[PDB]
């Protein structure tokens, strides 16, 4: 085959056909003071390849040649064929070339076991050889995916902003999670409120103030704005980049955004409810949801992250009031027996007499989420 | 096909076996059943010249190997 | 075992703590050189600075974010001369902001005079360039009206 | 030049030289109401890539076809050269071909002026043209670098855990700061102690114990782990 | 293929492959007013279906035209085969005529856009061509089922 | 009718206006599928008309259209 030779290999690319036979030559380095023989066998086209004997080398067209020989051993590659001609395909099957050791090396003298003979096969076309059809030229596309060598502890969690710590699955959690954050796809199409930054995640920012339905301003009203300070606009995903895509009650502390050395600052704490409850205000879609100050300060621009959460359940808030509302879709599907791999972190889950560490799952660190992302 | 060391072989080792001839008369082929078979069948020529490795065909001598040890025993 | 995360910074400098107790340690080095005329691009948040009656806003500083650490400790990049020309893009409107080098050691470096902070939109793409050797002269910002008349 | 031709391009990564003459076609596309000339010329190596005047042009070989023409205009591209045979070199100056319209195209009719004379031009070498000396294949290395298309205020701080906010340089900062985090090198080299978590920014593990050197247990001894 | 040709294609029902080239004739002739440029060419059976560019189209045995042209460009559809003859199924690849624009139409004078160029396609067995087995004519049903259009 | 594969692929469309509503697979068994993830009985138009396809495997994945927010962005 054209293969066999890099310039008629990288010709074949511009015809679409072949015949012709090739010369092999077959070069040995021995002394003599080796002793030892090889054979070559013809093997047709349309054979098998099956294992042989070499008993069974000798039934074909052969050669066996001793290692000591000094000039190369031709051998002719004939186009053995069924049909006029070639026509690129992998179902044309073509002369094979089979080489077996036949008799043992054995070299002599004072024996240096490392002593081996090295054998190089080269080729060239005869003059039969011609290309057939005059076709377009070369070229293609491509090209591949690889994935970035960095282990899933020292990586970020795409959904609360830790570290990874765990590396799991679990066939008894939802099977096909709703997740906002830490979605992208392959080929680098982002998916839902997923942000760059893991800094931005489960963040927000916001205008925030106090105003007064029920009066007694507790509750600061947050119309939201993205987190690099730009105007959100409701859009084609649920809410802010990197907003909380979980439900609870999580507590936020929130600080007046950082402009310029000596901005001066205040930072409050707050909790919010993310959940769907209940005649019942709050849509990150709008821009619009209120915190309340743990009553139970600061205003103009803030920024808010999350300190901790209060029964938290891994299920999308109610972000756009009961109104349908732009969601990357469930994950999935799988096989039949295959389980989601989980990366996990742990959010500090209060009480209220007792914060302990709750799992939080999400399906690449983000790493992964930004190197799809920038690869494209 | 049989390429033998002759060329690199130096002149250690004797190329042809010098040997008497065998004694015994040549003997006749197929003319004997031509006329009594029901069919004399031939087989294809190529087969007819090439040197086969037969199925009995490999032995070894060492040198735990005594003289009388049989090698191979080949029937016709 | 326990896991630590800042809360806030008290007295912050932006020097290094002393790791290794007095003794010599290994160190990323100091990032540079520079051209004359080149200053480095800084990637900046706020950390909660407290007091003590008052907590506010305090700068810091870094040379990539993070998503470009990770990308370029993923990709293994083939690198084929001393830094790259970029351009911070507004892909909206298709303004270019300025140009800039990014040296093959991890710091983007731009050419202005002033004294002075300057500050730019961050909305804020960048895009490769070249490879420029290493004495590219880039093109200055700052500056201000450049227009001129023949008069 | 071999470039010219995509088959001869390819096979120039195999041989160290040539010489020959091509042969160029062009075409127009116009029907028998139009009119306008071009003009080709032919400029030999060594000459300069000044400017010219359709008057200029005229000086040299050329050829002037009327954009009715249906036949294709054959012009020879000639190897006038000052060696024996070319060298792979940027070096090497070769015979030119410069077209410019020699008449304002003039569509008469209903006149659309959509309507414009489309020209293709192709190229054979000839007979004479061979490749010189064969020497090893094809193939190189690479690539290049790109950046994702990411805005800084989307993006996650390398050495505080919060979003970037800021875009700036400020010549009375420390001009050459010593920072450990989010050092990492073009090629993809980590320096310091840098992490590829943003979550790990900032932020450490340890066991952690009271010992009593003074006795008061107050102060927290940590033993430090990876924070994987 | 038998189907380039309404005569060929009926009789194709009647045989069990074939064999040879065909005679190919397109047919121009807009207003003295028009100019552009076609290119076909043909493409060897075995390159598979990739979408050409002008260009690429080049890098293959072509032929270009004028859309004035009064007399009828003809082509030869070489049959290029790989085996001895060819058979009525789907395991055939044969060779192509691919014609495509070259340069963008464009009428001069008082262009009346409802002016495109009507163009026409003519074949003929060359004499090589022959059809090979004899069999059933027939042997293409096509029971389709439809619904009803009713609404809900 | 005679039947040459596992399921017909159909359009149900406003033949009035013309606009289409879905595709669906109308299984050999008599019964008609649509791809939905909602939880959620959504409800069609009923002035409505279906059409034949194709035939179609049985694993043949049909649009789910619906949720016609496409969220996300890119640009």
Same mark, same amino acid.
């Given at each position: 085959?054209?293969?066999?030779?890099?310039?008629?290999?990288?010709?074949?690319?511009?015809?679409?056909?072949?015949?012709?036979?090739?010369?092999?030559?077959?070069?040995?380095?021995?002394?003599?003071?080796?002793?030892?023989?090889?054979?070559?066998?013809? %093997?047709?086209?349309?054979?098998?390849?099956?294992?042989?004997?070499?008993?069974?080398?000798?039934?074909?067209? =052969?050669?066996?040649?001793?290692?000591?020989?000094?000039?190369?051993?031709?051998?002719?590659?004939?186009?053995?064929?069924?049909?006029?001609?070639?026509? #690129?395909?992998? #179902?044309?099957?073509?002369?094979?070339?089979?080489?077996?050791?036949?008799?043992?090396?054995?070299?002599?003298?004072?024996?240096?076991?490392?002593?081996?003979?090295?054998?190089?096969?080269?080729?060239?076309?005869?003059?039969?050889?011609?290309?057939?059809?005059?076709?377009?030229?070369?070229?293609?596309?491509?090209?591949?995916?690889?994935?970035?060598?960095?282990?899933?502890?020292?990586?970020?969690?795409?959904?609360?902003?830790?570290?990874?710590?765990?590396?799991?699955?679990?066939?008894?959690?939802?099977?096909?999670? &709703?997740?906002?954050?830490?979605?992208? =796809?392959?080929?680098?199409?982002?998916?839902?409120?997923?942000?760059?930054?893991?800094?931005?995640?489960?963040?927000?920012?916001?205008?925030?103030?106090?105003?007064?339905?029920?009066?007694?301003?507790?509750?600061?009203?947050?119309?939201?704005?993205?987190?690099?300070?730009?105007?959100?606009?409701?859009?084609?995903?649920?809410?802010?980049?990197?907003?909380?895509?979980?439900?609870?009650?999580?507590?936020?502390?929130? &600080?007046?955004?950082?402009? !310029?050395?000596?901005? !001066?600052?205040?930072?409050?704490?707050?909790?919010?409810?993310?959940?769907?409850?209940? #005649?019942?205000?709050?849509?990150?879609?709008?821009?619009?949801?209120?915190?309340?100050?743990?009553?139970?300060?600061?205003?103009?621009?803030?920024?808010?992250?999350?300190?901790?959460?209060?029964?938290?359940?891994?299920?999308?808030?109610?972000?756009?009031?009961?109104?349908?509302?732009?969601?990357?879709?469930?994950?999935?599907?799988?096989?039949?027996?295959?389980?989601?791999?989980?990366?996990?972190?742990?959010?500090?889950? %209060?009480?209220?007499?007792?914060?302990?560490?709750?799992?939080?799952?999400?399906?690449?660190?983000?790493?992964?989420?930004?190197?799809?992302?920038?690869?494209? | 096909?049989?390429?033998?060391?002759?060329?690199?072989?130096?002149?250690?080792?004797?190329?042809?076996?010098?040997?008497?001839?065998?004694?015994?008369?040549?003997?006749?082929?197929?003319?004997?059943?031509?006329?009594?078979?029901?069919?004399?069948?031939?087989?294809? *020529?190529?087969?007819?010249?090439?040197?086969?490795?037969?199925?009995?065909?490999?032995?070894?001598?060492? *040198?735990?190997?005594? *003289?009388?040890?049989?090698?191979?025993?080949?029937?016709? | 075992?326990?896991?630590?995360?800042?809360?806030?910074?008290?007295?912050?400098?932006?020097?290094?703590?002393?790791?290794?107790?007095?003794?010599?340690?290994?160190?990323?080095?100091?990032?540079?050189?520079?051209?004359?005329?080149?200053?480095?691009?800084?990637?900046?948040?706020?950390?909660?600075?407290?007091?003590?009656?008052?907590?506010?806003?305090?700068?810091?500083?870094?040379?990539?974010?993070?998503?470009?650490?990770?990308?370029?400790?993923?990709?293994?990049?083939?690198?084929?001369?001393?830094?790259?020309?970029?351009?911070?893009?507004?892909?909206?409107?298709?303004?270019?902001?300025?140009?800039?080098?990014?040296?093959?050691?991890?710091?983007?470096?731009?050419?202005?005079?002033?004294?002075?902070?300057?500050?730019?939109?961050?909305?804020?793409?960048?895009?490769?360039?070249?490879?420029?050797?290493?004495?590219?002269?880039?093109?200055?910002?700052?500056?201000?009206?450049?227009?001129?008349?023949?008069?």
């Amino acid at each position: 085959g054209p293969h066999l030779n890099p310039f008629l290999l990288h010709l074949s690319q511009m015809y679409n056909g072949w015949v012709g036979n090739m010369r092999v030559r077959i070069m040995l380095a021995g002394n003599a003071f080796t002793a030892g023989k090889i054979i070559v066998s013809c %093997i047709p086209p349309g054979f098998g390849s099956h294992n042989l004997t070499i008993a069974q080398a000798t039934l074909f067209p =052969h050669v066996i040649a001793d290692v000591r020989t000094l000039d190369p051993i031709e051998v002719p590659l004939e186009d053995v064929r069924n049909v006029l001609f070639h026509n #690129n395909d992998r #179902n044309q099957q073509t002369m094979r070339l089979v080489c077996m050791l036949y008799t043992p090396l054995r070299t002599g003298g004072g024996t240096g076991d490392s002593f081996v003979v090295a054998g190089r096969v080269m080729t060239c076309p005869s003059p039969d050889f011609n290309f057939l059809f005059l076709v377009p030229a070369a070229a293609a596309a491509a090209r591949m995916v690889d994935l970035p060598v960095i282990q899933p502890r020292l990586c970020t969690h795409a959904r609360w902003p830790a570290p990874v710590y765990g590396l799991l699955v679990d066939p008894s959690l939802p099977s096909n999670p &709703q997740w906002q954050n830490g979605r992208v =796809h392959v080929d680098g199409t982002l998916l839902g409120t997923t942000p760059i930054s893991g800094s931005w995640v489960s963040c927000f920012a916001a205008e925030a103030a106090y105003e007064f339905q029920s009066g007694t301003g507790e509750v600061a009203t947050f119309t939201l704005i993205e987190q690099d300070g730009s105007a959100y606009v409701p859009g084609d995903r649920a809410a802010p980049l990197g907003y909380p895509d979980f439900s609870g009650q999580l507590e936020i502390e929130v &600080q007046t955004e950082t402009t !310029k050395t000596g901005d !001066k600052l205040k930072v409050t704490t707050f909790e919010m409810i993310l959940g769907p409850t209940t #005649n019942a205000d709050q849509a990150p879609y709008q821009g619009r949801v209120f915190a309340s100050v743990t009553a139970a300060l600061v205003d103009g621009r803030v920024r808010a992250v999350p300190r901790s959460i209060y029964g938290f359940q891994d299920t999308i808030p109610e972000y756009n009031d009961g109104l349908l509302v732009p969601l990357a879709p469930p994950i999935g599907p799988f096989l039949p027996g295959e389980v989601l791999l989980r990366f996990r972190t742990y959010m500090r889950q %209060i009480d209220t007499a007792d914060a302990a560490a709750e799992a939080i799952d999400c399906a690449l660190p983000q790493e992964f989420v930004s190197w799809f992302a920038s690869n494209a | 096909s049989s390429v033998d060391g002759a060329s690199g072989a130096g002149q250690l080792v004797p190329e042809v076996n010098a040997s008497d001839p065998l004694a015994m008369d040549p003997v006749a082929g197929s003319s004997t059943a031509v006329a009594t078979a029901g069919q004399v069948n031939p087989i294809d *020529p190529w087969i007819i010249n090439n040197f086969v490795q037969a199925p009995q065909g490999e032995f070894t001598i060492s *040198p735990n190997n005594t *003289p009388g040890d049989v090698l191979f025993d080949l029937s016709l | 075992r326990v896991r630590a995360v800042p809360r806030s910074i008290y007295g912050f400098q932006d020097t290094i703590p002393e790791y290794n107790d007095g003794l010599l340690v290994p160190l990323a080095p100091p990032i540079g050189p520079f051209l004359p005329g080149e200053v480095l691009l800084r990637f900046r948040t706020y950390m909660r600075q407290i007091d003590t009656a008052d907590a506010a806003a305090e700068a810091i500083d870094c040379a990539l974010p993070q998503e470009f650490v990770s990308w370029f400790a993923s990709n293994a990049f083939t690198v084929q001369s001393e830094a790259l020309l970029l351009r911070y893009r507004n892909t909206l409107t298709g303004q270019l902001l300025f140009e800039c080098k990014l040296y093959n050691e991890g710091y983007i470096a731009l050419s202005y005079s002033g004294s002075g902070p300057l500050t730019f939109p961050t909305d804020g793409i960048f895009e490769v360039v070249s490879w420029v050797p290493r004495l590219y002269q880039l093109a200055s910002v700052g500056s201000l009206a450049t227009g001129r008349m023949l008069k």
